[PDB]
Amino acid sequence: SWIERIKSNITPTRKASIPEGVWTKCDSCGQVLYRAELERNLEVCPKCDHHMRMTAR
Amino acid sequence: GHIVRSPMVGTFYRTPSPDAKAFIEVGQKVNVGDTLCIVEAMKMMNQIEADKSGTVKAILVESGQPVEFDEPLVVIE
Amino acid sequence: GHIVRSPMVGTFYRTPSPDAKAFIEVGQKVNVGDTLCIVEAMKMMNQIEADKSGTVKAILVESGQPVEFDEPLVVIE
Amino acid sequence: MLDKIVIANRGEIALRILRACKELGIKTVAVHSSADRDLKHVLLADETVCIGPAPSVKSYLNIPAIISAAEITGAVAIHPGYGFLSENANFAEQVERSGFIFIGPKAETIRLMGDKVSAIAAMKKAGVPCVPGSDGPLGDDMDKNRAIAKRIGYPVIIKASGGGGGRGMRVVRGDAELAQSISMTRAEAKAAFSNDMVYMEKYLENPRHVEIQVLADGQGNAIYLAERDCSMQRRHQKVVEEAPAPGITPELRRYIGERCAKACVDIGYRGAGTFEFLFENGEFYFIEMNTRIQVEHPVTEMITGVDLIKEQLRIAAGQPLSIKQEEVHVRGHAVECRINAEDPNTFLPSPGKITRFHAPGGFGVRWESHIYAGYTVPPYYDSMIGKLICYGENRDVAIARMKNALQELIIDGIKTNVDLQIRIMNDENFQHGGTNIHYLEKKLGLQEK
Amino acid sequence: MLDKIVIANRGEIALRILRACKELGIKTVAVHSSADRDLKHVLLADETVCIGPAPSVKSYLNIPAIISAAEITGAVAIHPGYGFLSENANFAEQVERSGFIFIGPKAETIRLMGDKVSAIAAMKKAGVPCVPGSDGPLGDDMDKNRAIAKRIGYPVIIKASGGGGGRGMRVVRGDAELAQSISMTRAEAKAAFSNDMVYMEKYLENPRHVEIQVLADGQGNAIYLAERDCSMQRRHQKVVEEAPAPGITPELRRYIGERCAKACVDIGYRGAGTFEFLFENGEFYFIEMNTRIQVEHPVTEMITGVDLIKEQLRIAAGQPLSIKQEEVHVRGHAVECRINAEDPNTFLPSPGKITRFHAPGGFGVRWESHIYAGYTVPPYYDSMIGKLICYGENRDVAIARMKNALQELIIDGIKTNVDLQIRIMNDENFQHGGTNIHYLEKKLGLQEK
Numbered sequence A: 001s002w003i004e005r006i007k008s009n010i011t012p013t014r015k016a017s018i019p020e021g022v023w024t025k026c027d028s029c030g031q032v033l034y035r036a037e038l039e040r041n042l043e044v045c046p047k048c049d050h051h052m053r054m055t056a057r
Numbered sequence B, C: 001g002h003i004v005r006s007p008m009v010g011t012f013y014r015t016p017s018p019d020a021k022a023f024i025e026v027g028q029k030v031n032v033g034d035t036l037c038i039v040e041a042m043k044m045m046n047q048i049e050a051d052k053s054g055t056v057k058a059i060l061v062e063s064g065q066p067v068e069f070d071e072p073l074v075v076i077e
Numbered sequence D, E: 001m002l003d004k005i006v007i008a009n010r011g012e013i014a015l016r017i018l019r020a021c022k023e024l025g026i027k028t029v030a031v032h033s034s035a036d037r038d039l040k041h042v043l044l045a046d047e048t049v050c051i052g053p054a055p056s057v058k059s060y061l062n063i064p065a066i067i068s069a070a071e072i073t074g075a076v077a078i079h080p081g082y083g084f085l086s087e088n089a090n091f092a093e094q095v096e097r098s099g100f101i102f103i104g105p106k107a108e109t110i111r112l113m114g115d116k117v118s119a120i121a122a123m124k125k126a127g128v129p130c131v132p133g134s135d136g137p138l139g140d141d142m143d144k145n146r147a148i149a150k151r152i153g154y155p156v157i158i159k160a161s162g163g164g165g166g167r168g169m170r171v172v173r174g175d176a177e178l179a180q181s182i183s184m185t186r187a188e189a190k191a192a193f194s195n196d197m198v199y200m201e202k203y204l205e206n207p208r209h210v211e212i213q214v215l216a217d218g219q220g221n222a223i224y225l226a227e228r229d230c231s232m233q234r235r236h237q238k239v240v241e242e243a244p245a246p247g248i249t250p251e252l253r254r255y256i257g258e259r260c261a262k263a264c265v266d267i268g269y270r271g272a273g274t275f276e277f278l279f280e281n282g283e284f285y286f287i288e289m290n291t292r293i294q295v296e297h298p299v300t301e302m303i304t305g306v307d308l309i310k311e312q313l314r315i316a317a318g319q320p321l322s323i324k325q326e327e328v329h330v331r332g333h334a335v336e337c338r339i340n341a342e343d344p345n346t347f348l349p350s351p352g353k354i355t356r357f358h359a360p361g362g363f364g365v366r367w368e369s370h371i372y373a374g375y376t377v378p379p380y381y382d383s384m385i386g387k388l389i390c391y392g393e394n395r396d397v398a399i400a401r402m403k404n405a406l407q408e409l410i411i412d413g414i415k416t417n418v419d420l421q422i423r424i425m426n427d428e429n430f431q432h433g434g435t436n437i438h439y440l441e442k443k444l445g446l447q448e449k
């Protein structure tokens, strides 16, 4: 009876390798974002529209 | 009492570093503003903060076991 | 009370002949051994016999309407 | 072969993908919300992950949460299905760069084809016929707009190029409201699809919705399956499909299939997609391409024997097309009638708890749904609660089987659109085959004294 | 065309016939008992007639009651289906003379073929291979019996020529009990089938149950569909069928189909029938013919697209065969797993009330049953409560779909044989394809210390 089934835990350990330089964080809101997307949006967090640091050049 | 639940889904830890001390301890009471555990996602270790003060009744989680949203982690009385 | 039911399935009638009198009448009481209606099947008119004596309370069927097994035909009190 | 994928969807399509994965031997990863913790496919999966609260924005449109779930479980690909993140090009780009495999077109083709004006321009570049029109978003000059409209011929319609889902488009009858209608359509497109681009196209009054499903592996191979026909539309959204369509002789079928295959070859398409058209006196007019597994996919599987999701899972695994042009055989006919939990007349969703459920069953009946006894319909997502097909040998047989199944089908506890389906089936013009797109609206009628 | 027929059966086959009648536009007459007043097909019929109390002898085996119901409702034909009065030759004769049309073979062919020894003699007359044996009921001479057994080769089996239903037959290992076994088999045949005729036939140890479905209109036309394979038998009764069978190359398929068609032409057969066989190293051995719609009929419809009941209704209407030999195409594979309300291990029927029911659904799943929520299983008839098919593209796909459906399928409240079905599916030899008839019994094993 799959209607009454409990939820087992996910696999304790699996080797997953996401590239390290494709995710950032916004302490103002908390929504994780795509680094290249953010860099293409003039360093503006698209979710909460909170501006961040930008290189002078 | 009140039980803290992780608002995100990812790998769970207790020490912020591979060789360090856990943020909190069972027994000794904790306050409203404090970090209790780390729920890492996409290699970005985020912190978990309680909201009520009280004695640490028990810890319902173990290091290295992934958890999800609305998962009771640590109960505070 | 007790209601007679046809044990077979077929055409129902009340007069044994195309132009005749019905076996029983509403009102006036009937006895255990009596014929009350005809339930014809395969052009073989068979008779229907009650089992209890009493007053004819009402007739729940009409001539020419087929009935089946366990069909209450006439109620006898 | 993809060792383990992620069902980046919910509901009926999620269950269908789960069944296909278990058929092909691919393991399962279930991602769900907190409200949908008793979904059929969720309960019938090895690994269940909850990635947000009840609202769609926080749970299923949370691309970071989906990628986190795909990282923790060790998957190497993700299937979006239809809806939600089906056509999100940025989602495809992130999944490609996150280290996994996107089951669908490359993000570049998603950008090129999802935007309607770019898709029409590319189709004209490839020789596929398109509706004459502006071929570009118009400005604030009413004189230019009316000149273009007179060039193409009134009436005209303004549709959001980044629009979809049966909204974000307004029909213009005359110049007395053209500018205001264009501005409000642009505002609606801003509010819905985060794009202000709106264009002008020739408006037709007697069309026949004809669409062709196609497949391509992106390696110089392009095959086309049989056609479709969704003439029974409500609010520009489909309610009763059928495939193949009446009147479309095999000559025209091959003629348009070759053009669609050439278009897929030129664009370098990958995955499962469909080229919509508009049919009238032998003329086809491309208007949009859906670069995803279309909801009315079953009415093509049953008339060809080819499982679309299996094709997508094989293509995403890199295997070349195992089916050639001559190895596709059109054998039969089909009808599909969606079931929704809305109000039959007022079209208000009616969520709640289901008390009694009973599948039709029988020869040629294929009942795609996740509803069950005691399943509480959540008031949080689309109103679809199941699809229903009745494959026959001809159209009349299919209609008869659909009528029988609808008589057999029982859903109690919430409001259902079964009555409208029965009325559509009983219609003589519908049973004849070949009604116009607005036929449903003409049968709808209007107000009364 | 038959304007209105009678469903002279109950349950699953009754519902299937009702659906086919409503498809073809033929009206419906429902004949039922007093216990089965809430059957699905009974409730889904225009005219319902109750022709007896709970026991089968008084209600469904009451030929006068069926003919009376067919007279009052105005039908012009009757469909028996399988079981009950499927092979009652006298029933066919009475229905023919009563003024109606019997959907099935002529009573003469029923008499000639139902009796096993006469059927074997006729098959040998037509050239169809048969098991070497007595070719006639033996007497009380043990010397003659053992001489014949040595002629054909031990071991030997005694089967009731008027027998059937997996009973009325005993296997003989040696002469130490031959006479007693023959006498008790004759007594059982007397007690069951009202006939004492018992015969001797060669007994095989490693057979493969192969049977071929055929059709004929009795007018010089005889077509044969694809084969079948019921290797998984329990107590000589089928539990898991499949069609076509492994190893049977199209050369052998055509070779035996031509012979079966010639046999049907010679006998002047009418209706839907199947020629059973026994397969070993390329040799076929006819043992019996079922002159009715066989229960495992779906596994031939889905691999050919031809509806058997529609064929029977057209043939009984006098229309010639609309399908020729070259117009039958074998495309696919199938598996079927019956569902019974018996005890999984002890094989004791477990009637009662059903609490929760849920159909599998999905691509290629076809669920034939009448059970529903709250349906009370009567303790009065056969223990079958539904059939289940999963049509695939190859055997492995079909097995996978069956596993998925059985996981999805839920029947609660009464004991079901689903667990045995799962165990059979999980078996490696079964998934390989080509097991022997006793394979199931070998997997059964025996007692323990």
Ligand SMILES: Nc1ncnc2c1ncn2[C@@H]1O[C@H](COP(=O)(O)OP(=O)(O)O)[C@@H](O)[C@H]1O
Pocket (backbone or CB within 6 Å): D131, D157, D163, D164, D165, D166, D167, D201, D202, D203, D204, D207, D209, D233, D236, D237, D276, D278, D287, D288, D437
């Ligand atoms: N140029 C047109 N002329 C007439 N009807 C149209 C036109 N464009 C769209 N429609 C109607 O709207 C439906 C949906 O159009 P489509 O562009 O596919 O929008 P969506 O993205 O909302 O599905 C079509 O099937 C058709 O019935």
Ligand SMILES: Nc1ncnc2c1ncn2[C@@H]1O[C@H](COP(=O)(O)OP(=O)(O)O)[C@@H](O)[C@H]1O
Pocket (backbone or CB within 6 Å): E131, E157, E163, E164, E165, E166, E167, E201, E202, E203, E204, E207, E209, E233, E236, E237, E276, E278, E287, E288, E437
């Ligand atoms: N001569 C035989 N040798 C081996 N097995 C047999 C033989 N005859 C019958 N059987 C077994 O019994 C099954 C049923 O036989 P059949 O004659 O069709 O009886 P029934 O009328 O009960 O169906 C066959 O499928 C086969 O497995």
Ligand SMILES: *C(=O)CCCC[C@@H]1SC[C@@H]2NC(=O)N[C@@H]21
Pocket (backbone or CB within 6 Å): B012, B013, B014, B015, B016, B017, B018, B019, B063
């Ligand atoms: C990434 O490559 C692995 C490091 C993740 C955190 C490490 S591994 C276990 C250590 N203890 C702990 O709480 N976190 C540390």
Ligand SMILES: *C(=O)CCCC[C@@H]1SC[C@@H]2NC(=O)N[C@@H]21
Pocket (backbone or CB within 6 Å): C012, C013, C014, C015, C016, C017, C018, C019, C063
């Ligand atoms: C057979 O041909 C018809 C005769 C059946 C009985 C007749 S018809 C109605 C008459 N009244 C009655 O009660 N039975 C007579």
Ligand SMILES: [Mg+2]
Pocket (backbone or CB within 6 Å): D276, D288
């Ligand atoms: Mg569209």
Ligand SMILES: [Mg+2]
Pocket (backbone or CB within 6 Å): E276, E288
């Ligand atoms: Mg048999």
Ligand SMILES: [Zn+2]
Pocket (backbone or CB within 6 Å): A026, A027, A028, A029, A030, A031, A045, A046, A047, A048, A049, A050
């Ligand atoms: Zn932010």
